[PDB]
Design an enzyme around this catalytic site. Structure first.
Site, short mmCIF file in Angstrom:
data_model
loop_
_atom_site.label_atom_id
_atom_site.label_comp_id
_atom_site.label_asym_id
_atom_site.label_seq_id
_atom_site.Cartn_x
_atom_site.Cartn_y
_atom_site.Cartn_z
N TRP A 253 17.29 -80.98 44.37
CA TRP A 253 16.14 -80.46 43.63
C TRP A 253 16.12 -81.02 42.18
CZ3 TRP A 253 18.52 -78.14 47.51
CH2 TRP A 253 17.82 -77.29 48.38
N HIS B 23 9.62 -70.02 49.85
CA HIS B 23 10.78 -70.54 50.53
C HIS B 23 10.43 -70.47 52.02
CE1 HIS B 23 14.88 -71.50 51.51
NE2 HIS B 23 15.06 -70.35 52.13
N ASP C 278 17.86 -69.57 58.49
CA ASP C 278 17.57 -70.27 57.25
C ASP C 278 18.55 -71.42 57.12
OD1 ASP C 278 16.76 -70.97 54.66
OD2 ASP C 278 16.68 -68.87 54.03
N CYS D 132 13.96 -77.01 51.05
CA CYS D 132 13.65 -76.06 52.10
C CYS D 132 12.62 -76.33 53.20
CB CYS D 132 13.51 -74.65 51.55
SG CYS D 132 12.00 -74.42 50.71
N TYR E 273 9.75 -75.26 41.89
CA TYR E 273 9.20 -74.27 42.84
C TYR E 273 10.17 -73.14 43.16
CZ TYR E 273 11.65 -75.57 47.23
OH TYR E 273 12.54 -75.79 48.25
#
Ligand SMILES: [Sr+2]
Ligand SMILES: [Sr+2]
Lengths: 700, 705
Positions: free
Chosen positions: B265, B359, B382, B300, B538
């Site tokens: 990220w 997410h 996840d 993600c 984000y």
């Protein structure tokens, strides 16, 4: 930084230095000294450590000397504890300890226990849920222009361990006897052999020895364990156990069951966790090699040292790598002989795992207490890992729905052996089932002395009991597996082997009871193999078919003899031998099956001392081993250990001619008083898994 | 010494079975198969009745628990009185019947339920045509076929024949398969559809984009088998949805250098592709199979992207889910801490926790036999790691029903996904002396909307009620208590409302923030409001505060007041991050009562899309010219512009590069595609440059036969 505002602090070694400037202290005195109240009271006096070590949820005294008298009016200060590199009051890694009129339970705080001309005595309490580790101490003074704070000071580093003495701590154990045993005791005994012949041997946990505590923190740092969770006995055991078995140049020990051990120390040589933990710390790479009881000795050292009440558990006839199947397949042939091509799964003679004491606030009420954690990997839901912590209490009842990996440890102790004849036309028919073999005896060290304690009743109900059948009913409902339909499943057969010494001959009788008012024509087969302790075959050293005629209400006994030369040629490290006996009742076609195991007795190592049994006093230790083989044992290593008396040591003899006895004398300066112990082990290119020990009593 | 036979944990590793296998003592006039026929071909029944006619594969593909036909030609007519034989399916280097890696499959009078068996359905001169049925619990993988003729001396069996290898996938169409979906609409969507939409942006401006799952594309099915192979997954586990997803999700995030993708990220993306450029899973998955090392980079939605392809390709129904206002990295806590100064300002130093704008995770369908009855169905998994019991791994499968009911005592990792969606915001004031005081709790921010793509088309389907009950109501309350006792942690414990709405702007335009107060009581109060605006990622992590504002307002008894603020483009254009989102904190002090009010919202700046036009013959097999078109929206130059085009079944992922592009200029890209799939297809385009990024576009085409 994209992912998170601040990185994770999963290292207790990384440190940040708090600024000194956004009244003053001249000296901070803790009452460290191993004789003083604090250590003696926190039960942390046995630790060979020169820093203050306390147990959470309890008060301890400290003293701050100010440049001038503390005045409750215009003065304000508070002690600070900080851990890792990104402390956060939010995560529990930055704890401001405020001054209070009284200390509430479960909160941090400091009562001004007493002040006299420019000094203040303090009574500091910690939360019973505090992160375990090694904190830094600071004193902060809140001026109208900013905090004034102490400089970096190593001699105040306080270690905060778990506390089985505190009833607000999840690790709480309410029995000083057990507390001493499961937490304070630094010597242990490991059971093995076979259900009929339990062999014991001492292991040195050595949790209080110099350095072990700091390495326990190193393993965690090496596991990149979030500091915010070291205060959780659950995740602590969950992560700690996964670190024990080196998953590729990662964990502590490198497992191995290849009777060669090409490049390290044979699992059967280690005397304790000490040199193991210290070697991992110094090399910073996995230690070669280990096996179940080893992994168990070490993980237990890790737990006790932090304060979680742990103990080693040994299960006899363990169904390992069960994949949650409650059935072991034994493949018999049409005439009745064990089929070796198909029968590929084995029962371990014995298997060692750990139990840890804690509460399970993640499960319903009643599943707290002893938790089963098995550091020896096997396929479970995640795929080939350590298993647990699984509540022994749920296991007992078949509640395998609750975490962690409960269906796999349940099957270790509850499996059935299925005797299935695979027809030569490619068909199957299950001839018999042995519900009574696996998990025949689960055992551990008693609280008094080096004895044995039968804890079998804790993992399972007695057979036949509906609670037993209920637990199965339940287990089967949440993931237990019984894939083969055992539908329709009067001669009583049974055999016995007399245990012998390595190199000697022994008998194996077979008894045949016939309760029916009729005769039969039995055809038996005896099949003897040489196996690893895991139960895996190396070879069949003796096959033997019998032809028995049974009269009605007859009872015949036959005696086979196993001659030494029939095995001495191909033995394996633990001296295991496996016997299979099957029969066919020609008339009715019934197949009778029965299997047993035995280990050959190995002569011990002799430990004898002379001198002054006084701390600080030189005391000479004599070690001697006699090679009882008709061969010369080469490259012989003798290991010496004894926590508090001697650090671990080892010697090597190029060779030891057949039947000659060596001796090794080393002088130790016992540093601990009271009953201590000396421990010896033997390992050579051939014979190994030889042990000796001694019960010294140091004075002072 | 550890195990008698090594672990059978590779589908690509193989054993060579002997042709002749005799034993004992004693021509061989037994029957010899001259050839085998597995009526495969896309048109034929098997591939069609099994729903695998769509896989661009040359070998027989079949779904478990359901029968298929084969035909074996013998050297001499089959005689049911002398001849005895049977087909064999084996998998891996170390096949074992005990464990379903070796399967005999006998000839059978009539096929039973969930048991391998072959029934003779037709006998022409010299040819037997069987109807073979598999077990619904069959391992999923590529099995080797063999025909074995039993002689009373041993077996004679065929030789290695690679063209007869058979894949057996999970089967959502079979009532006896753990993974069963009861109706065609769903099965069609969640299993047969190789295209989806990903929902991003923020609650008050939900943005969508097409993503190619491309499960049926060439090489994907196999790559999927390689993944499980790289994870050393025991073959006997490959027939279990739970293990496939527990293990497979863990392979998605390259921890060290094991998994499929390296997550990042950083907005830089040193030596890899920006997660915003990926158009679909095909690219990554293949690239990874050739590299054999992790692919850079993903975030993600990309892990959810590549994981969804994986799931559907093997045959497990799965869908991506997008939760708005996510409390990731929650460590079971049910509270989020925002720190304030005594004067009412946000304490930029102590507030280190952040709420993710959105997410995405996956929902995978299967029953749950390790749990009590009632927890089967969609399971949340996840692939984006976070600390859980094991610490820093994916979480799941957590039973979505168990979450809605606070039953976090069940595996796997339920407390974490539970606080991902049902957590509060606590506003605490950190007094100058060192203490803290809790001003107010905002309990309706996190978990605002959980949404997924619809069955019919590209619309959204609000699934928020599958995760939670309504705020207020008893069930939501009880759910919360049920959680708190089994894991969920929850440490901490003047009628002048306020609120502001942002009028979402387009990238590069000035815009407004409109805060409005209101005084219910009959008191003339006095407020001192604060406004902090930050450029953020984000995930919620800030980079800077571009606009700080503070103003005092007096409120009439029983009143209303709307304060407007104009944010100029220049105040932010200079330091935006990918996805262009901005964060606002509006806090106020009503000094009379010393009561503190606080609120937060977020905005993503709208960026114009890519234009795609199809020119030509929209007919399978016939060329068609595709034109991708992008116009620089900025007032400066973009350099090293990578444009991507993808369309599963129309063209495989192709990318073009432009050295630079002047401000307000337009570039076209013409490629001639040869669609190989008919019907409603689609075209995805994406853009990435050193400056602008996260720019996508799509087009719907219908290709005739
Ligand atoms: Sr039993
Ligand atoms: Sr809520």
């Amino acid at each position: 930084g994209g992912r998170r505002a601040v990185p994770p602090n999963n290292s207790n070694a990384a440190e940040d230095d708090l600024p000194t400037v956004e009244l003053n202290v001249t000296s901070v005195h803790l009452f460290k000294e191993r004789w003083d109240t604090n250590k003696v009271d926190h039960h942390t006096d046995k630790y060979e450590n020169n820093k203050l070590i306390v147990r959470r949820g309890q008060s301890f005294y400290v003293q701050i000397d100010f440049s001038r008298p503390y005045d409750p009016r215009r003065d304000l200060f508070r002690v600070e504890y900080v851990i890792g590199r990104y402390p956060q009051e939010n995560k529990g890694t930055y704890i401001p300890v405020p001054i209070v009129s009284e200390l509430q339970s479960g909160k941090w705080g400091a009562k001004i226990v007493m002040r006299e001309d420019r000094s203040v005595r303090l009574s500091i309490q910690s939360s019973p849920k505090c992160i375990v580790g090694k904190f830094r101490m600071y004193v902060a003074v809140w001026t109208p222009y900013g905090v004034l704070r102490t400089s970096r000071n190593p001699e105040t580093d306080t270690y905060i361990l778990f506390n089985p003495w505190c009833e607000d701590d999840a690790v709480y154990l309410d029995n000083e006897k057990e507390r001493e045993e499961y937490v304070l005791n630094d010597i242990g005994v490991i059971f093995y052999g076979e259900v009929n012949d339990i062999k014991t041997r001492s292991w040195s946990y050595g949790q209080f020895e110099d350095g072990i505590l700091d390495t326990c923190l190193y393993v965690m740092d090496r596991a990149q364990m979030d500091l915010s969770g070291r205060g959780n006995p659950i995740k602590v055991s969950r992560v700690g156990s996964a670190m024990v078995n080196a998953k590729d140049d990662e964990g502590v020990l490198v497992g191995s069951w290849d009777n060669i051990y090409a490049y390290g120390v044979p699992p059967s040589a280690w005397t304790g966790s000490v040199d193991i933990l210290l070697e991992y710390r110094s090399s910073e790479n996995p230690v070669r090699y280990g096996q179940c009881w080893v992994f168990a000795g070490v993980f237990n050292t890790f737990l006790r040292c932090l304060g979680i009440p742990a103990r080693i558990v040994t299960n006899y006839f363990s169904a390992h790598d069960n994949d949650a199947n409650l059935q072991m397949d034994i493949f018999l042939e049409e005439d009745g002989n064990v089929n070796s091509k198909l029968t590929k799964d084995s029962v371990w003679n014995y298997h060692c795992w750990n139990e840890a004491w804690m509460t399970r606030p993640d499960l319903p009420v009643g599943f707290g207490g002893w938790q089963a954690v098995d550091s020896t990997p096997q396929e479970n839901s995640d795929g080939m890992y350590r298993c647990g912590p699984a509540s022994v209490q749920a296991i007992k009842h078949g509640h395998v729905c609750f975490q962690f990996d409960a269906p796999f440890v349940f099957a270790e102790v509850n499996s059935d052996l299925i005797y299935i004849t695979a027809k030569k036309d490619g068909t199957h028919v299950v001839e018999n089932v042995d519900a009574t073999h696996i998990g025949k005896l689960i055992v551990t060290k008693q609280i008094g002395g080096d004895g044995m304690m039968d804890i079998t009743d804790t993992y399972k109900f007695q057979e036949g009991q509906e609670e037993e059948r209920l637990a199965l009913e339940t287990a089967l409902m949440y993931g237990a597996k019984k894939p083969l339909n055992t539908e329709g499943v009067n001669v009583d057969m049974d055999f016995e082997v007399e245990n012998a010494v390595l190199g000697k001959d022994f008998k194996l009788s077979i008894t045949f009871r016939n309760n029916s008012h009729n005769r039969y024509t039995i055809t038996a087969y005896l099949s003897a193999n040489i196996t690893f302790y895991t139960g895996v075959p190396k070879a069949e050293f003796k096959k033997e078919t019998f032809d028995v005629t049974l009269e009605p209400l007859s009872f015949k006994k036959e005696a086979v003899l196993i001659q030494a030369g029939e095995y001495m040629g191909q033995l394996l490290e633990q001296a295991s031998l496996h016997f299979f006996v099957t029969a066919r009742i020609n008339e009715t076609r019934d197949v009778l099956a029965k299997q047993k195991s035995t280990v050959l007795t190995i002569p011990e190592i002799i430990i004898k001392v002379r001198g002054t049994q006084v701390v600080g006093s030189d005391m000479t230790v004599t070690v001697e081993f006699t090679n009882p083989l008709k061969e010369t044992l080469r490259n012989v290593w003798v290991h010496l250990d004894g926590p508090g008396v001697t650090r671990p040591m080892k010697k090597m003899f190029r060779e030891i001619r057949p039947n000659s006895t060596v001796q090794w004398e080393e002088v130790c300066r016992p540093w601990v008083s009271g009953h201590r112990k000396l421990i010896a082990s033997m390992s050579s290119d051939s014979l190994r898994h030889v042990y000796g020990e001694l019960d010294v009593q140091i004075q002072r």
